[PDB]
Amino acid sequence: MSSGRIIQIIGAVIDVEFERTSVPKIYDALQVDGTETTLEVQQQLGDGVVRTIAMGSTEGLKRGLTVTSTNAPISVPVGTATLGRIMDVLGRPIDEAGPVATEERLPIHRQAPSYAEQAASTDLLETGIKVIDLLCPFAKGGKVGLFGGAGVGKTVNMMELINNIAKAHSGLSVFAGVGERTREGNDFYHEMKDSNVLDKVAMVYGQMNEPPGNRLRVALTGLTMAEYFRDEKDENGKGRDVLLFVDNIYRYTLAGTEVSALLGRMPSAVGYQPTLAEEMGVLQERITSTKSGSITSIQAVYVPADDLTDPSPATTFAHLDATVVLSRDIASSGIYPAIDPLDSTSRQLDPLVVGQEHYEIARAVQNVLQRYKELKDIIAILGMDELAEEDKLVVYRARKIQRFFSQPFHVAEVFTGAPGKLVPLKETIRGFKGLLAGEYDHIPEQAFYMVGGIDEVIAKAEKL
Amino acid sequence: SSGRIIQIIGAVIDVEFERTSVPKIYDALQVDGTETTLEVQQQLGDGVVRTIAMGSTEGLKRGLTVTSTNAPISVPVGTATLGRIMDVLGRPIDEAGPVATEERLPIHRQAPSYAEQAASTDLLETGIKVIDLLCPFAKGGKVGLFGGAGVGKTVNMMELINNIAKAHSGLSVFAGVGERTREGNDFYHEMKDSNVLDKVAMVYGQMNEPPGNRLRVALTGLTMAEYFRDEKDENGKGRDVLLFVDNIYRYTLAGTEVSALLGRMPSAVGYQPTLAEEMGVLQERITSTKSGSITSIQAVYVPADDLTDPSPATTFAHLDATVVLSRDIASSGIYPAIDPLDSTSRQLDPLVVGQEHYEIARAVQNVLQRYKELKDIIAILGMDELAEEDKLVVYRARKIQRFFSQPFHVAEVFTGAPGKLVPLKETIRGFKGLLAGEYDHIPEQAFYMVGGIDEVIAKAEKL
Amino acid sequence: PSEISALIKQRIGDLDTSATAKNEGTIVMVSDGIVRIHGLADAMYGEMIEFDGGLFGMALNLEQDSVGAVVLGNYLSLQEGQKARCTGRVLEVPVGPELLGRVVDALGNPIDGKGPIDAKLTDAVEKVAPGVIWRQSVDQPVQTGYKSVDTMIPVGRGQRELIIGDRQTGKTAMAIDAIIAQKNSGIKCVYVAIGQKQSTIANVVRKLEETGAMAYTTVVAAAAADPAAMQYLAPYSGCTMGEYFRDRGEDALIIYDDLSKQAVAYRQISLLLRRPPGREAYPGDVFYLHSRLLERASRVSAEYVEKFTNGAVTGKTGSLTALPIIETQAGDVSAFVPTNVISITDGQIFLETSLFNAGIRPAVNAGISVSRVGGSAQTKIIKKLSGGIRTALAQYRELAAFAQFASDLDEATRKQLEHGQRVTELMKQKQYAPYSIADQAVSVYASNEGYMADVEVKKIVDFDAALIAYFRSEYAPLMKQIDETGDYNKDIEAAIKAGIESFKAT
Amino acid sequence: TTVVAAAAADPAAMQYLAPYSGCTMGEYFRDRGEDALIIYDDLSKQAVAYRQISLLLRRPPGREAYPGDVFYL
Amino acid sequence: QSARMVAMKAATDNAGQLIKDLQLIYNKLRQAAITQEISEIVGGAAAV
Numbered sequence A: 001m002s003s004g005r006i007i008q009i010i011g012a013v014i015d016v017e018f019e020r021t022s023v024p025k026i027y028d029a030l031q032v033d034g035t036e037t038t039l040e041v042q043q044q045l046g047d048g049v050v051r052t053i054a055m056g057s058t059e060g061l062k063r064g065l066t067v068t069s070t071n072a073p074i075s076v077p078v079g080t081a082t083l084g085r086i087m088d089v090l091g092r093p094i095d096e097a098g099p100v101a102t103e104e105r106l107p108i109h110r111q112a113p114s115y116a117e118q119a120a121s122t123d124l125l126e127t128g129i130k131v132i133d134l135l136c137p138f139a140k141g142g143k144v145g146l147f148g149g150a151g152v153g154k155t156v157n158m159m160e161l162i163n164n165i166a167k168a169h170s171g172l173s174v175f176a177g178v179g180e181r182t183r184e185g186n187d188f189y190h191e192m193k194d195s196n197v198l199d200k201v202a203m204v205y206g207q208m209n210e211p212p213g214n215r216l217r218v219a220l221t222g223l224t225m226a227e228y229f230r231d232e233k234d235e236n237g238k239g240r241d242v243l244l245f246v247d248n249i250y251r252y253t254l255a256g257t258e259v260s261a262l263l264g265r266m267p268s269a270v271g272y273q274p275t276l277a278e279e280m281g282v283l284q285e286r287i288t289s290t291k292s293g294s295i296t297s298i299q300a301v302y303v304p305a306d307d308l309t310d311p312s313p314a315t316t317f318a319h320l321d322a323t324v325v326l327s328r329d330i331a332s333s334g335i336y337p338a339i340d341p342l343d344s345t346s347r348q349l350d351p352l353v354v355g356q357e358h359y360e361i362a363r364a365v366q367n368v369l370q371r372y373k374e375l376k377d378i379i380a381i382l383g384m385d386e387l388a389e390e391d392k393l394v395v396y397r398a399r400k401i402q403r404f405f406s407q408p409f410h411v412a413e414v415f416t417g418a419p420g421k422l423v424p425l426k427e428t429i430r431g432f433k434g435l436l437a438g439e440y441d442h443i444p445e446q447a448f449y450m451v452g453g454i455d456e457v458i459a460k461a462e463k464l
Numbered sequence B: 001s002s003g004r005i006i007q008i009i010g011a012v013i014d015v016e017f018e019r020t021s022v023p024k025i026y027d028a029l030q031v032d033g034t035e036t037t038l039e040v041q042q043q044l045g046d047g048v049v050r051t052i053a054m055g056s057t058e059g060l061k062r063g064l065t066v067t068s069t070n071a072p073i074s075v076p077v078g079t080a081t082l083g084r085i086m087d088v089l090g091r092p093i094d095e096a097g098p099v100a101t102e103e104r105l106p107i108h109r110q111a112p113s114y115a116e117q118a119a120s121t122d123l124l125e126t127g128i129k130v131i132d133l134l135c136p137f138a139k140g141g142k143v144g145l146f147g148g149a150g151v152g153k154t155v156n157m158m159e160l161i162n163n164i165a166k167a168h169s170g171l172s173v174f175a176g177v178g179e180r181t182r183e184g185n186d187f188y189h190e191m192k193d194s195n196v197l198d199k200v201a202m203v204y205g206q207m208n209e210p211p212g213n214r215l216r217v218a219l220t221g222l223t224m225a226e227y228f229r230d231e232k233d234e235n236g237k238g239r240d241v242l243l244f245v246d247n248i249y250r251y252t253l254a255g256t257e258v259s260a261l262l263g264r265m266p267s268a269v270g271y272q273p274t275l276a277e278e279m280g281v282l283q284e285r286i287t288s289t290k291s292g293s294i295t296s297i298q299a300v301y302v303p304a305d306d307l308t309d310p311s312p313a314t315t316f317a318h319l320d321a322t323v324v325l326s327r328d329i330a331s332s333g334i335y336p337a338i339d340p341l342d343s344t345s346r347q348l349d350p351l352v353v354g355q356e357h358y359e360i361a362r363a364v365q366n367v368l369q370r371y372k373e374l375k376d377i378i379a380i381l382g383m384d385e386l387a388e389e390d391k392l393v394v395y396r397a398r399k400i401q402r403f404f405s406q407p408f409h410v411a412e413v414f415t416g417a418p419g420k421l422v423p424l425k426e427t428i429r430g431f432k433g434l435l436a437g438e439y440d441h442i443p444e445q446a447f448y449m450v451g452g453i454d455e456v457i458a459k460a461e462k463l
Numbered sequence C: 001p002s003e004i005s006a007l008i009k010q011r012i013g014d015l016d017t018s019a020t021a022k023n024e025g026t027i028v029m030v031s032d033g034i035v036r037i038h039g040l041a042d043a044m045y046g047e048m049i050e051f052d053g054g055l056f057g058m059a060l061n062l063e064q065d066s067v068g069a070v071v072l073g074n075y076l077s078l079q080e081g082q083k084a085r086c087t088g089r090v091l092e093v094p095v096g097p098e099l100l101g102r103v104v105d106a107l108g109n110p111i112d113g114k115g116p117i118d119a120k121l122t123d124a125v126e127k128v129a130p131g132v133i134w135r136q137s138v139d140q141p142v143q144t145g146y147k148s149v150d151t152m153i154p155v156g157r158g159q160r161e162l163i164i165g166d167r168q169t170g171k172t173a174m175a176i177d178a179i180i181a182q183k184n185s186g187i188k189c190v191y192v193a194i195g196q197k198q199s200t201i202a203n204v205v206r207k208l209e210e211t212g213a214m215a216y217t218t219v220v221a222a223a224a225a226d227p228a229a230m231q232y233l234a235p236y237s238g239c240t241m242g243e244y245f246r247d248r249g250e251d252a253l254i255i256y257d258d259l260s261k262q263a264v265a266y267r268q269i270s271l272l273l274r275r276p277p278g279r280e281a282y283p284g285d286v287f288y289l290h291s292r293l294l295e296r297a298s299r300v301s302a303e304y305v306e307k308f309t310n311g312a313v314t315g316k317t318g319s320l321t322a323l324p325i326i327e328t329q330a331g332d333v334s335a336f337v338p339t340n341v342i343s344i345t346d347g348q349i350f351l352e353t354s355l356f357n358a359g360i361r362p363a364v365n366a367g368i369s370v371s372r373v374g375g376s377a378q379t380k381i382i383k384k385l386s387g388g389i390r391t392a393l394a395q396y397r398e399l400a401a402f403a404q405f406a407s408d409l410d411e412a413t414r415k416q417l418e419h420g421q422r423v424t425e426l427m428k429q430k431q432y433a434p435y436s437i438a439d440q441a442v443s444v445y446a447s448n449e450g451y452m453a454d455v456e457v458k459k460i461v462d463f464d465a466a467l468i469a470y471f472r473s474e475y476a477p478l479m480k481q482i483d484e485t486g487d488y489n490k491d492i493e494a495a496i497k498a499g500i501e502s503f504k505a506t
Numbered sequence D: 001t002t003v004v005a006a007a008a009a010d011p012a013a014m015q016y017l018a019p020y021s022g023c024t025m026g027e028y029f030r031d032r033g034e035d036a037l038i039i040y041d042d043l044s045k046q047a048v049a050y051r052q053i054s055l056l057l058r059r060p061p062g063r064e065a066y067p068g069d070v071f072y073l
Numbered sequence E: 001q002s003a004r005m006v007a008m009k010a011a012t013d014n015a016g017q018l019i020k021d022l023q024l025i026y027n028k029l030r031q032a033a034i035t036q037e038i039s040e041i042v043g044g045a046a047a048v
């Protein structure tokens, strides 16, 4: 018969026996016959008995209660209507916007793309954030870890990213909240709501309070979302590219460690799920650019124990295509975005990749900034007077670079009425290389604050 | 009578036996299909016991038949085993025909009695400054090369074999234990270039071999040497026995490999609990007795370069002659890289070494000790902000370090500079002259990678 | 059209012509591609295992009443009770020269999607090392297209030499260059991808076919997402394919990439078998587990070739050279697995983080990087010109180290420092910049002749390149002659210094 | 105000369970549309006791003998 | 005065490099210890 009954449960573990003729395969959906609790097939304990974890609470439930199968893994709806809705792990409405209209659903646990499906080329992913555009340029199917503390508009940063991707290239965006600090999630919802960006992104949060399994699986949930969206192709083929932001995959690792303990198998060397690398690859290699269409992913990450030798960041670095860090003092200097420009690094920093001239200009700029940091200490301890003249020029020009980095945003535009800044590559570089000639030493550093292109800078200098 | 295979895990086997016939704990068990052989280890009882295999574990199924020899592993023994290359079974690998003699000897035996030990009181001059200075030897003692991976455990042995071999005349044996095949073959050909090739015998149990083979590999050669020491010359006794161990750590490692499969427990790190007793059993059958003299050299790999590991710790309880290598000294390019301090010798006796030897050595170690101590502050502070005598001692010790740096006769392979053999008298006089400060005006470069003090004079005046 | 019809008809008239006697065992327990099967007694340890799903298995545990085994691929379509048969035959893999220009499954199945390829020979994967009486001393060079590498750290045919460094510090690019060097040599070269990103994979590929190297070349891949079994097993298979030509008296070359992943994957798998671990979760055999594979590469005797091919050859000594890869955490050379592997290799190379951070590409920590063989493969020119220069610069490193907290420097220290600076700048090259022998030959000549301690610090490399141009233009027959031979004559160096003066005049 | 006590001499179970109770009583007045505040004391010893129980419950050991469910809790 | 500043700057540099040394030492030692007690726990649990 197509259902079984509860035979034993401990902790988060559930056991049910079946007949030998009907027993599901792994990951298939199992609904508790009598409540809304759902069970995920994990491994076959034999004797008609199989082990599963329930999605949701563990009470209200006692042995002998029947539980059925769907003989299929978790299938959650996919469609354009998914935008603007916040859903549970099971893709069930939690914004109280009614049930999702789209009944077109797809399975989750699915195979990574083929070798043939590996996009045969690599090319620079673009955006409007000059420091991103130059100091850490991205590529489609990109994976960058984010670093920093709290109080810098990380959310705001993402908002501008989504606005730009939906504007320039109509690239879609989805977010997954893993271990969300519920209040912060609500606040972020309101924030993305006042901004009309709400309509352009799909929302599911895994609140840390939940049973660790669903918290684990929300990742693949949003992953499948993005897969469908990119594979959702307009005319002429070549569907749009999609963007994914993942909330602190470190929390995901923690949940994996939890559930690893839950099965009651071996805790690893430092103590982790030993299979962590495999599920890493499950995540990563399922995300890239395709032969037609791409999905790029930007992921929050916290470093436990502030160490770079514990396993989690080590495994993480196997996939971080670039490094982006946020510095507190930079925000304290009113510089926005408050990204530390000098130390965030991109693997995609080769003249082979970024372009020869582009590479040279970037190298020179970072050299200048490095020099300036070597200088400002001697300045403060000895006054700006005691420097060589070229040293002073470097000081002023680098500070001009920092000011030029300061820019308003279209997200800031609604926040405080002021036209946002949109700037591509080869638009920044012209002004930068001109600055390398020192042709703006007459131009005050103030003429670079909260400004877009170098033409706008010179216009400001005119009005100033 | 015969047995049948019932389970296969890794490299450990179990077999069913008739209630009438249960072979003793140590016997050869022939695979009735192949050449594969088995040794018993555990009496699992109820007509079933546990064993390991020697050779490949493949081509083996369950229920297959195996006989017993009713005889433990007893291998061919005698001088007809010299100049030959044997397996772990003591069978030719050189393909120079089967061995001639018919005498066999079991690999297992109890240790010799207390009433049989000997006073190894015979020194040795080698030609390596640090060794003959710091570690006087007893002809018949145990010589271990404590060192990490790639510190020069093999090199230090090759050069000694050169020097030792040429300075000696008589029996000698080598047994490759779990090492790179290339180095072993190269050594074999080098020995073939020599002629004591005849005087010696070869056997290689190498890393490629299965761990069952890897375990009882030393037993062969050690038993060989024990015989030859007990093999008395007519109107005389046994001869001077040259023994050379190659990473007994490999044997320890195999014991670790097997213990869990043996139904055994995991030591404080994971070793077999029985590691100490088996190491002692191994070592005790190694001694120069009232009969004959046995001289043993031990290759001592050090896991992760750690001393506090249980195995080295146990090892010191076994080695009268202790020689230790360092990674940082090699990081300084000093070849060899033996640490002066920890490598010690119980032969270091003023009534034995002569007063001047003793006191000069002690003063040297004292100087090095202060230098190492002050290393911290000199790293922190400026070298100039120190007392003058302190700085003098610093330069003294550095020049001492350099004066230890010596080219070796086989070391010219990676350098080209001709190796040296420095008589102990030159060493003593040169070190005393340094400690006298007769050379404080001499550039430190004049002492690097040299031999005797006269070489130092030539280098300095050249410079 | 109809040709496929005739082919399929005759392939159908070919086989399945009769029933077959066989033995089955059904599933008992499953977890993570690790399964418990009961009912097969005729089984072989690690044999191929038949399954209705079309996949296969390798046998692990021969207990009294069942077997545990390992999947080869994913297993989500598997469940207890299904049918599971035995091949009665050991693990194998197709091997042949046909593999050239192809990248396939870790079980030799074309992932390129360029048609399946038959290999008239197939060989078991797990094999043992040859006999000592068949080994041959390394005597033949291998060129790396480098100055720093080829000179200070010689590597000959058949040597094993680990490469160790950090992330994005230049670990592979080096091996790649070495392979490209072998283009003209025509030696056998083959590389294995082991648990890395397919993006990186296709990058390597596209580079290779750009070079056109992927015609005397074969590569197989273990994807980072593939279930750990293939990661564990693949390097053995790659060694198996490589040994084919060494088994034919033909020198061979293998490149192992990131054995660390394979090591940890095996650790995990074996631990899932609940076996007790040693230090940092690694079991003991891991040392053996890798080393046994490593020993399979060596330079062997033509006599061994004859013993292998029993008349099928005239007898030439074969070899296989090994390129393993292990990464170091925070530059911990003393790390456990590194300590294990260094005890195995015939030598090692380590790359310094800061110099690559300082832009030095490559960035050698020559301080600890040596070969057991050393000067048994270099050309007499190279071998005589080298010999202590690596030691000299190593001591220059420590001199500079000591020369920062002391204000006194004698003329010996002064000269050592100043010449170390020049030679340091002398050891630079570009990515994909190979060298002919005369290149580094004249460079080191100039260095030893002090012809560099005289010219501008920065202009060193410019002088070098312009010198190469100067000579290979004017002296092209000269360098052609010298590099075609590898032998030095004094009149040759007379011509060299004549060119030295002429170019210094320019 | 009110206080609930889990003395050190008490059996570990009640100590383990009390904080949730006090939470429930607080939520009462949260559910009463008003506001109040709660203080949580010695959660470390609470975890200690819970670990001991789990051990006596034959539950699989965790890092520092802590099954991961503690963070969940 | 100048030379005192130089010497004290050098002292600062020495302290910084040692500081890096100590973070690395602490990290490895902590990892090793943690793994060690984990080994003890897993050994103990296997008993009963």
Ligand SMILES: Nc1ncnc2c1ncn2[C@@H]1O[C@H](COP(=O)(O)OP(=O)(O)OP(=O)(O)O)[C@@H](O)[C@H]1O
Residues within 6 Å of the ligand: A350, C166, C167, C168, C169, C170, C171, C172, C173, C361, C362, C429, C430, C431, C432
């Ligand atoms: N000679 C060189 N000059 C300049 N850059 C170089 C040189 N050699 C290698 N590189 C650069 O080193 C960078 C990092 O090395 P690469 O990404 O190829 O592999 P890797 O060091 O093994 O790192 P991973 O851990 O990602 O595998 C490459 O992007 C390459 O361009």
Ligand SMILES: Nc1ncnc2c1ncn2[C@@H]1O[C@H](COP(=O)(O)OP(=O)(O)O)[C@@H](O)[C@H]1O
Residues within 6 Å of the ligand: B147, B148, B149, B150, B151, B152, B153, B154, B155, B156, B334, B335, B336, B408, B411, B414, C343, C370, C371, C372, C373
């Ligand atoms: N006497 C020496 N002087 C200088 N360098 C040496 C000397 N011996 C060895 N080296 C180098 O150090 C390496 C390690 O030597 P080896 O004895 O083989 O180490 P291991 O303990 O691993 O067996 C050698 O391959 C050689 O390159």
Ligand SMILES: [Mg+2]
Residues within 6 Å of the ligand: B148, B149, B150, B151, B153, B154, B301, C343
């Ligand atoms: Mg060694």
Ligand SMILES: [Mg+2]
Residues within 6 Å of the ligand: C171, C172
């Ligand atoms: Mg790489």
